[PDB]
């Protein structure tokens, strides 16, 4: 009795995602792609990167 | 609903209806955004027959 | 709404007739290969 | 029809129309604690609440089952 | 009209002897239900759930006795 | 159909109570979606200790007409 | 009228009439150290009055219980 | 399956009541294991924990008794 | 809906969505404090800070024990 | 097979009425001695084994049942 | 020849053969501990082997008496 | 006797979580012994003694727990 | 020799393993009474008495595991 | 090993054979390439009547 | 050992023949040097009839 198994497999990720926060005049808070509260009152961007 | 229809020789039909309909009666929570938003019904049943 | 009806004739094109150009449009396609064709060969043409 | 219910239902119900509220008001004292966890009137306040309800649900449950027991032992005897 | 044998005169005896059991176990669960919280209430409703226990399982294991000895007689008519 | 007198008191019992035949299957289809509930636990105890009752007394009934049937008719000979 | 009492009655009642006053001393402990709850001297008082209390309770029912068992272990030999 | 019982019908129904708890407290486990000290995967894991004891105690107590409702049934057929 | 969820897991999310983001104010603030160990400032904060995450995670493992006490006592009554 | 009675197909009618269960049992029984302390190996035990009880019994009566009957029908032979 | 056994003898036996040699590793695991017993590796090591071998008697017991019930139940058709 | 039932293969996945702290802790012991009034020795030691403790407090209540959850389904066989 | 029980012998295990403790636990506090002041006989004393609690505590806790198998296994010979 | 042995008149044997062979399988648990000189083989079990 | 004699006129001895041997397993044994000492003879059991 012959039994035979044959795989093949692909893949491929690549690029980037964004997300951060700036604070202006002590008035206006501004956060993009975040849930969070922009807690830092002070300007942050976080880049992504995936190959 | 459940129902089961009967045709008179008269033209007319007959049916014994039970009916049931409402709102549930929920423990969980009662708050004014709720009560305003979403209509209070009764809660009804109803059984008898009708021509 | 419910629309019943009767059948009586197969399908037009085949199945697998039809599988092969999704496959292919697809690239998912395998016969290309260098060494499935052993095994593969067995199942479509047999 | 009207939904059926017998002896044990009633028994058991007696307990929940008995206790109007808590039932609820342990849902809600439950939500201000965890909107401010550290303040102790809402501590003081929720011990109560917690303590009276698992007190409730143990004597019901009790009672359910020692009236099934008396029922269980008459149905015995009708051989 | 009511009619009763000598069973129902057995049974029935229990339930003469026992003048409002039957009405305080409502009463005591009835107070109960309201304040689950009470040790008197909690420590009386202990005591007359138990002896309305007793007193049923003594009455049907009675009443059964009798039926043994009634259909023991009766099968020797023969 | 053709129903005898054991049939009958024992559909007696069917129709008595209308509904708990479902009622047990619908509070345990509830309470397996989610057991660690406590309002659901509380319900299904006096529903499923409910139906054993219910079983229990109707087989016992039939039994026992049945003894008085066969002891009847053992006297014809 | 009055109430039908049985044994485990009068088991019961041995300690409600045995404990003459300790069931109003706990109450009127606690209004007073409550209305006051700083004074050392309230507090000394209170704890053993509230210690009396749980032992008190506590015997009775383990009494009765006992007794139960007894009853029902002599009544299933009827059978 | 090949065959099954009522019994095996209600112990189903569990089994498909709770979805993924299966795996869920497996893959916990691991975790935790990973970082025995950071709080939050063990206040996950007490979580899952409970749960899955919970499960397991209301399915094996429900074949019981509708075990015995059987046996009782099949007596009377004598 | 979420991946699976029984009654205790909602207990706990109530928690973890009642103190909306402690968790990384208190995660930063110590990257802040390690950095210059010396400012009464930053101290300060984070004294205030871990007593609050302290608070919460206790509270947090007492509520789950105490249902699953209430849940174990009525499925033992089944049988 | 060669030769059977009416109450050898009433006995029968159970043994092909339940499928596999006869060999489900006794799989899962090994399956558990392998490892005796897995929930899940368990709570799979306890139910076939279960509906193996009842499957015995139910069987037994029914052939008593009908062995009476076919008694009585021929004691009036003579 | 071999000594003779029935069907019970062969219900219990299939766990003495299944589990492979725990009787003889939980005397290893006490006498190993027995002398030492403040170490933590070998106190951690016997807590395991102690409740493995319980939970295996108890299977084993459990299962013997079932069998032994639905025999019983059989034989006394014959009557 | 490589033999290991489910309860022995949950204390293992710790021992084998923590790969090497069963032996750091022992190494940081000799190296402080060697000189107890190092600031740097004892700021080392406290941080791997405790976590040593945690590791082997969740290990045994691990294990606690899943054997009250079998003795539960077993004490149902009957 | 006297009869002796298993959990004779489980017993008798711990003391012939701890063949001198039960002595040395006592010398050392013979001689600490005598200066109840020097550092080096407490240092000495703490670790001696901690072992005997250890081994006490082990001991009577391995005995009743094994009273409550065997209880567990006698009551199903009925 | 199990067996069972018959004579022919050819002088052929035969006989009813089963065989359990192997090792126990490992406790799920570490080891090293140096202990895997002591080898692995599966476990096998093989019933059948040969002549 | 367990043994049943017969005699046979040809002057040979016939037995039914059960063995049982070995050292009890002890598979922790703890150090190198007490295995050095001691020598593994495997468990065996036989089972068999002969003249």
Redesign the interface.
Known sequence: LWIVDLNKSDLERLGTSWSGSITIGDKLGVSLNQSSISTLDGSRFIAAVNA | IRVLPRFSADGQIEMSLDIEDGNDKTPQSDTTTSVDALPEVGRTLISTIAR | MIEPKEIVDPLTPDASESVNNILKQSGAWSGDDKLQKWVRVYLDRG | ????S?Y??D??A??D???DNL??QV?EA??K???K??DPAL?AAYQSK?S???????????????F?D??????Q???
């Not at chain 4, 029809?1 to 059926?4: F, G, I, R």
């Not at chain 4, 009276?52 to 020692?66: D, G, M």
């Not at chain 4, 008396?70 to 149905?75: F, G």
């Open positions: 029809a009207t939904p059926w017998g044990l239902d028994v058991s007696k307990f129309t008995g206790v039932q609820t849902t439950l939500d604690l965890a909107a966890p550290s501590l917690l009276e309800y698992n007190l409730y649900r143990n004597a019901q449950s009790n009672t359910v089952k020692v099934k008396i029922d269980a032992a008459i149905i005897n009708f051989r």
